[PDB]
# Entry
Amino acid sequence: HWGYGKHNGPEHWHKDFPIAKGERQSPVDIDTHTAKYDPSLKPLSVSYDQATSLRILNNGHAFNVEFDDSQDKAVLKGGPLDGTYRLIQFHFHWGSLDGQGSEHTVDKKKYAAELHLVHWNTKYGDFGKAVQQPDGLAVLGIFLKVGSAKPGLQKVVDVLDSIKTKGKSADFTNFDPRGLLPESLDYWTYPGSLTTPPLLECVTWIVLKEPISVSSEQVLKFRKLNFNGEGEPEELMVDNWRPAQPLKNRQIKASF
Ligand SMILES: [Hg+2]
Ligand SMILES: [Zn+2]
# Structure
């Protein structure tokens, strides 16, 4: 099916998912000199104290750390957002080398990776209903650069040996996503879409300005993952990122 290679990569996705060429597609380039400080943006609230992780899954495209979202335990509100958005999962996109991997770019600059923390508008009852809505989803994007290790990422790094191939899952409880946040919550925001099929245009994007740094050895373990399922030829899970899409008639706002 859809993937990241020459023959099923993002340049092909439009054939199964015509909205690929839609009016509010993600990711985009963040032109810092075109983005406008928005004084009407309320402060951003990230409440991950009571977050309940359940498991980690390799879905043949990335890995998802999944959360119990049957209660308001880890929530996003404030900033551009109306009401409450509930954390369902996080995942990353990364490159084969450090000079690429992010989905969003800043002044055309690509980071080594990007973390996405995916939240759904509790107004819509469940994730499935929210992805039928222009304001159903809120994704918090955080860039990764290679430098010093990120201590609160290592529990993730160490579990990856056990979910090497498509469809493998491991138990993954008591993971604290607060360990992945940078010091600053400064951000850019714009209306967009999922960056993976079915590319639904339901997302308010909140991209933090301040990246987190991870070690070369942390990003390397990411790169030992497999796109393929157990017992198949080895395709390293790398370059699982969609490139910047046309901005069209959209405005990126700054919180700062
Ligand atoms: Hg939508
Ligand atoms: Zn993503």
